[PDB]
Amino acid sequence: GIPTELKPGTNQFLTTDDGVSAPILPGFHPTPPIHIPGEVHNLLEICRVETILEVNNLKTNETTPMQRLCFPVSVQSKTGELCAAFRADPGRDGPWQSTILGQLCRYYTQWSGSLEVTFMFAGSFMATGKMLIAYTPPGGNVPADRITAMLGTHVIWDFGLQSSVTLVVPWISNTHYRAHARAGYFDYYTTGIITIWYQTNYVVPIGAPTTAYIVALAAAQDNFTMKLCKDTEDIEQTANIQ
Amino acid sequence: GIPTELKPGTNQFLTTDDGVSAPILPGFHPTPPIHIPGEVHNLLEICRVETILEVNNLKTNETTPMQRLCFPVSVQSKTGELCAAFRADPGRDGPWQSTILGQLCRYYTQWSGSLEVTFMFAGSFMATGKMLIAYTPPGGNVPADRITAMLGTHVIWDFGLQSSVTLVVPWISNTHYRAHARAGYFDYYTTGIITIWYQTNYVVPIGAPTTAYIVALAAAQDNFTMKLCKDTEDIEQTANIQ
Amino acid sequence: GIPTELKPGTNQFLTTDDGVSAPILPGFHPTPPIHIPGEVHNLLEICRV
Amino acid sequence: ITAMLGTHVIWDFGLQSSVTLVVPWISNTHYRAHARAGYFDYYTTGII
Amino acid sequence: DPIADMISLTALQVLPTAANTEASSHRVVPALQAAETGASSNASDKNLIETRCVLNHHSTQETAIGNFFSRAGLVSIITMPTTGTQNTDGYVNWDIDLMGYAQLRRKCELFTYMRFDAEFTFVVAKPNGELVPQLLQYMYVPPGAPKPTSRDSFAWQTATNPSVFVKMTDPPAQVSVPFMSPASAYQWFYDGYPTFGEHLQANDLDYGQCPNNMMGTFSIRTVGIEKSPHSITLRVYMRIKHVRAWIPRPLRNQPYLFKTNPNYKGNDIKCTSTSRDKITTL
Amino acid sequence: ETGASSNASDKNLIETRCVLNHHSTQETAIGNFFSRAGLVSIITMPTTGTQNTDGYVNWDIDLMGYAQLRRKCELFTYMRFDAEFTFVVAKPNGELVPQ
Amino acid sequence: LLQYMYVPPGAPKPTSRDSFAWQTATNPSVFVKMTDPPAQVSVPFMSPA
Amino acid sequence: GSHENSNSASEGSTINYTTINYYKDAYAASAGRQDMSQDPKKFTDPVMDVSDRVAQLTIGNSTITTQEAANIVIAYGEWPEYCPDTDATAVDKPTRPDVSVNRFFTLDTKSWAKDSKGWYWKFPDVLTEVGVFGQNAQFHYLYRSGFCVHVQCNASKFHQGALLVAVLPEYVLGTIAGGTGNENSHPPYATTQPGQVGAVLTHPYVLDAGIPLSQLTVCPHQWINLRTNNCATIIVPYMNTVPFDSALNHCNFGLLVIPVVPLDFNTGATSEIPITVTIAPMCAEFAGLRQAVKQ
Amino acid sequence: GSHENSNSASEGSTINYTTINYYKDAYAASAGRQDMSQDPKKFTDPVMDVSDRVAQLTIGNSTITTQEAANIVIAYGEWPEYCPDTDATAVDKPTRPDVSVNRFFTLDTKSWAKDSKGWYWKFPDVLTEVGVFGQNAQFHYLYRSGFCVHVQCNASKFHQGALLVAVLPEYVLGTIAGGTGNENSHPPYATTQPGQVGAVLTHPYVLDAGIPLSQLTVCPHQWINLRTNNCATIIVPYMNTVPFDSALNHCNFGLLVIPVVPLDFNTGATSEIPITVTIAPMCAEFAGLRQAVKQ
Amino acid sequence: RFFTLDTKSWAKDSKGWYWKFPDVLTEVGVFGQNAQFHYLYRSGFCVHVQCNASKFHQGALLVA
Ligand SMILES: CCCCCCCCCCCCC/C=C\[C@H](O)[C@H](N)CO
Ligand SMILES: CCCCCCCCCCCCC/C=C\[C@H](O)[C@H](N)CO
Ligand SMILES: [Cl-]
Ligand SMILES: [Cl-]
Ligand SMILES: [Cl-]
Ligand SMILES: [Cl-]
Ligand SMILES: [Cl-]
Ligand SMILES: [Cl-]
Ligand SMILES: [Cl-]
Ligand SMILES: [Cl-]
Ligand SMILES: [Cl-]
Ligand SMILES: [Cl-]
Ligand SMILES: [Cl-]
Ligand SMILES: [Cl-]
Ligand SMILES: [Cl-]
Ligand SMILES: [Cl-]
Ligand SMILES: [Cl-]
Ligand SMILES: [K+]
Ligand SMILES: [K+]
Ligand SMILES: [K+]
């Protein structure tokens, strides 16, 4: 026999080891494949697809969940009011959890890249108005007023104009990659805050609703990638599946 | 010694593993082979050979089994009567079990291809008549009358004409391969039903029997193949062989 | 199987053995490196200070 | 749901103020005589 | 000739690293999208802000479905106790159904159809984790093959079925399995019935059952004419390999209740995302 | 009546479509059918009893004692082959000991 | 018989010896006997920096 | 050795992997290195044009004229097509009726109310009993086809609301499991195959199947936002693990119409806001002729 | 190393296998990949012509004229032939009598009745005591030969029935084991080697050997269906694991004639319907001369 | 394709029978269905009339 020496690792079973095991059915030929539309090769293909953001994730919605899928805008009596706010952290508990993007990146430890959020106005055609949407990079808490938020990356949207608008959340980090942000030391990887303000006002004539809704869709851009594959905390074997 | 690490599978004995074991008799030379007629290389060669179908597989035959090897036709008093019916499922319990084809495909989990059934009329030469033989694809139970069965794949046979006739059971499946069909979920892989009807009538003159028999032979066609080699349920070690 | 014979040393763990162990994360790509001043390659560089 | 099985067009106002339905010549004979009740109902063109 | 009425746009691309970023300045309407169409915004950084050039070498290899799935996961736990109600018979027949464990299941249900080969690993031990010199036999019993009715059953002769013989002390047994469906791919969702006929409420357990996914039985036993004194715990791990997948779909957001269907607890319907007090406060 | 199997196929009895059939016939090759290890004998050496409290056993080689394999071979009249024998040994309850 | 599992930041930590997390469908785990030689694996540079 | 049999599950794709192997069967090989292909333009942009509102599509003896259109979606970027000979398995010559079946059928109309939950229909269940298409579906064992789905909904410039129109392949439904989750109940034939009248979702948020509506957009879809458009159109290619299948036992996909942003309008404005579904099978093929079977 | 000895059981066939090996002996090698050869035309169509009824075959001083023939079968697609030098083992020069032995011998006739079970004969047992052939078989230790089997049965166009005429190599008979199956009985010399009179099957369904008559057609066979033909002919080549063998201790094959479709006719028609067997050995060779031995 | 309609019985005193085309198939299989859903139809026909009898029977049918 040939001189050999067993090294550490011998006999172990590494779940992620990519080796060669013996085949149980010699000469077996699988049913040939046929063309099926919709084949995907990389998860990223999916992360680039917009899914709905539950911006309206209130404790009072839980029993009428459909309401979380969109938040409202209405005729303001005061100028420059704040309409809604939320963190841009995609792998963080919150609005993002409802998106295919957030669910998928929860299967990875780190991520990197730019994100995009598209807002769609579903009010009546006769309603017009301009909103200021801003992304405030790390450091500042939620901007107190529109004049503060305005100092960050923003877009000024008009309905009458186009029904949808896209805010881009540029990758602005110190590190090349961010781990999922959460309270504590990992708040270091927070992405920032998104705020929606009334630039002018929701104006409508006689005959049309004074309150309408907006749907927020989110997805990743081309420069988005993820690394360090892990298990998701978003699924549980609470009991036995029968 | 050379650095090596044992991987899972080590020490196991897989009955279907095709490896190399040490030879017990070094330098041994087997008696040379001689020519023997009838060598076969692939089971399919055998499946293409017609063997007898026990269409007449009645509970009342079991004690006089020879009678199962052929079913009768006789002078009808009523038009368009049904002569016999049976499933085309070859790996299924029933008439097919008596054929070398059925026995062999019971050594495989799945199959695919067209089948052929040849009917041979063994009545007197003076007997004439036409029969309608049909194959009804999945979906419909046994056709109630000849006019219904006639809507499927069929052949119209005449004795006087030729003593034998061949019905072809085209491979008409949704899946590329069928697993053995049986009651329950696997009825999904049923092949269908074969029915034999009187197109005209068994006519005979004075002096000849008013009842004669037909022998059904079955085999596979060239496009027939099988996969996933398994053990047959058709043999048992009921007791110890001494 | 191929004829082999285990030799002394088999199963041992030598802390300074420079071998190859299986990777836990297949397809993983480390954050790329960036330029950082002050890289040293040999302790001697330091002993000269 | 029955009428829908025949030759049809689906029109939208907001879209265009006018729309044109075409009544294709679908006859057995190359020519039709004026249709009226009775034997000549044979030359009827159909229903809109 | 005497009759005149008788005479896919998207493709693949290889992207090893993330797309880069190019510079822009103070300057056509690419910020406003028409998301009513069912399309995802094709607007990027350079459109909405002034950017710098960034040579992005981030790799996309780890998000390839192969690296995502080819990680062995628990799909079954089989027990053969000596004292009790289970199997004081010394053998066990297990219908193959990998949908009994969520972690893996949720991953697969991300797709509608999947085609692949697999590596099965058999980790066996006593219920407390201890090991003993016990000989075992695992056998694959395809649909149609006779199932063992006892530890003595002739079926263990395994003349054609594939069987593995290993000691509880040897490392885990491990083998490769091919793509065995009679269809072009396994499908986690089958919106239909397996057979024809009326579908009375008595046979509604039929709904969603797809024969093309039913791979038979997995049998195991201690190798002896006599009963073994040891309780046995077998954990089966599966590593998908050589995989292709089609038609992505929403990820399960409700706890699983049953192996064969998507039934969910209607009284306690969980929200996909955590909640907060106000829409204007973090 | 001749002793021949019908040489009639689909194209003869019905109207057909073209089908590019890539189904493989490799698994039905007699080699893949037979080269699957099967049980051909069970030999026992008990310590207390009538069998062999002698510590040894002589077994006349006859592989026809187990049906599964036997029926497969008897499909043919003559067979020529080499073989791989595997010896699985243990105590009657499946336990193993340093013997 | 033992099981070692790497639980990256964000992955659910086992709350018991029965915890579902030991299903380890995505995390990398190693199964080895206290009698087998020492288990051994290679780890990449995992910082996000 | 090293030369083997071609039996790996991924041997018919334009994506190769580098492997290591010593057994005669290919599936024994390692997973190998993953090539890095991508097609993000079949989900994120499977739209028409890869004056768009203005239109008119004709098929069979039917013609639709859409003007407040939001363009057209081609599901997964693929056009319907008759089954190719390489993929085909059944040997009988299929029948391809053409005009009598590939045309526009307009099913029952539903009424959108401020509190509507949402509806769904199954394909091809919806047409199994309609016109020549249905008849062919009954007389044949096997069927294969594509679809053109046109959902219509008008409203004044003073109304508001948004419907999400999506196609979900293999739309398997689940039950609320007795509420407590201890009862393994199942949906009755009437709920799984509602026919041409369709059915109502009881829990739209989880699509009556334990999955988030919020992610349905990962499927071929289109929105009908009253202030922008009043109709949606989606071309759907055949999708299955088999080339042909029973139109009776298997529904290839379901069509969902859900009010994500509820209908609203000031009292005095028309309150009857209907939704109409018109569908046209495309490239219908049938095989395995026999007598008619309704189920 | 890798260069070895040529000692594998499959080294003399026109079918190669790809293997892996490290021992000096070839049989240690793996089974390897299976080539995919096939010869479905030696069982499914081993007929004559790969006016057929009309005929006349002559051999020796005998001639048969068959006209209601069903063509002729060449067992396993091979013609009888004297043993070739490569296969030969015995060194003495064989005697090849030719005409005196290769001719037609017509054995006793049997009567077919409405309740007949079926008959069988063993080869060469049937001729060991007939003419010059028999004499040579007795004086020689070794024998080798082929056979031409002609089974005859006439009947009017008003009779009906079907005989299956088949050849079964190594036709080993079994007993009913005392009925209960607890008695290990064996067939007496008179049943295993019935001589020229042949024997009667007691359980045709299982061919008195635990195997299905239904599958006998997997053997060189031919049918005599009264309404079509009145005779069958089968050429049989030598079959054994050895080149020559004792004509006394070993029967290479048995001939079976079984009424699968029973004889029937209206009373008044000839009731005596005989069956006659005529056989001719072909390419008879004998060796190992000594004194005559009858068994 | 071939549709096989009801069978009639020939008696020593039979007068004769007749069928109309396409009336005979208006309610049979897919052909019939198409005939019902469409206003216009056009087709050709293959007619096969069958009648067996022994070499001891006699008679002659005119099929036109
Ligand atoms: C001796 C080794 C035996 C190992 C054999 C294991 C074969 C398992 C094949 C994998 C089949 C994939 C699972 C397919 C379908 C799902 O379980 C279905 N939902 C169950 O109805
Ligand atoms: C140290 C290893 C010893 C292993 C030697 C085993 C040799 C066995 C050779 C296989 C012979 C095939 C069986 C041959 C004939 C049948 O058993 C007969 N029917 C018995 O009469
Ligand atoms: Cl995050
Ligand atoms: Cl009738
Ligand atoms: Cl079957
Ligand atoms: Cl055993
Ligand atoms: Cl892979
Ligand atoms: Cl566990
Ligand atoms: Cl990789
Ligand atoms: Cl209506
Ligand atoms: Cl309604
Ligand atoms: Cl809801
Ligand atoms: Cl092979
Ligand atoms: Cl005589
Ligand atoms: Cl007699
Ligand atoms: Cl019998
Ligand atoms: Cl009549
Ligand atoms: K040595
Ligand atoms: K050493
Ligand atoms: K070995």
Residue numbers in the entry:
A (entry chain C), B (entry chain C): 1 to 242
C (entry chain C): 1 to 49
D (entry chain C): 147 to 194
E (entry chain A): 2 to 8, 19 to 38, 43 to 297
F (entry chain A): 51 to 149
G (entry chain A): 150 to 198
H (entry chain B), I (entry chain B): 11 to 60, 79 to 323
J (entry chain B): 131 to 194
Q: Which sentences did the original study use to describe this structure?
A:
The external portion of the icosahedral capsid comprises 60 copies of viral proteins VP1, -2, and -3 arranged with pseudo T=3 symmetry, while their N-terminal extensions and 60 copies of VP4 line the interior, surrounding the RNA genome. There is a “canyon” (a depression encircling the 5-fold axes) on the surface of enteroviruses that often harbors the receptor binding site, and there is a fatty acid binding site below the canyon base, within the hydrophobic β-barrel core of VP1. Here, we remedy this with high resolution X-ray structures of both mature and natural empty CVA16 particles and also of empty recombinant viruslike particles of CVA16 produced in insect cells, a potential vaccine antigen.
Natural empty particles (without RNA) are often also formed, in which the final RNA-mediated coat protein cleavage (between VP4 and VP2) is not made. Diffraction data for inactivated CVA16 empty and full virus particles to 2.7- and 2.65-Å resolution, respectively, were collected at room temperature in situ. The natural empty particle is not expanded. Residues lining the inner surface of the particle are more flexible (with higher B factors) and some residues are essentially disordered, and thus, residues 9 to 18 and 39 to 42 in VP1 and 1 to 11 and 62 to 80 in VP0 (corresponding to 1 to 11 and 61 to 69 of VP4 and 1 to 9 of VP2 in the mature particle) are not defined in the electron density map. The overall structure is otherwise essentially indistinguishable from that of the mature virus (RMSD of 0.3 Å for 813 Cα atoms), and the pocket factor binding site is fully occupied by a moiety that again resembles sphingosine. The EV71 natural empty particles used in our earlier structural studies (produced by two independent companies) and those from a different strain used in another structural analysis were all in an expanded conformation, while using identical methodology, those for CVA16 described here are not (although we have observed an expanded CVA16 intermediate [135S] particle).
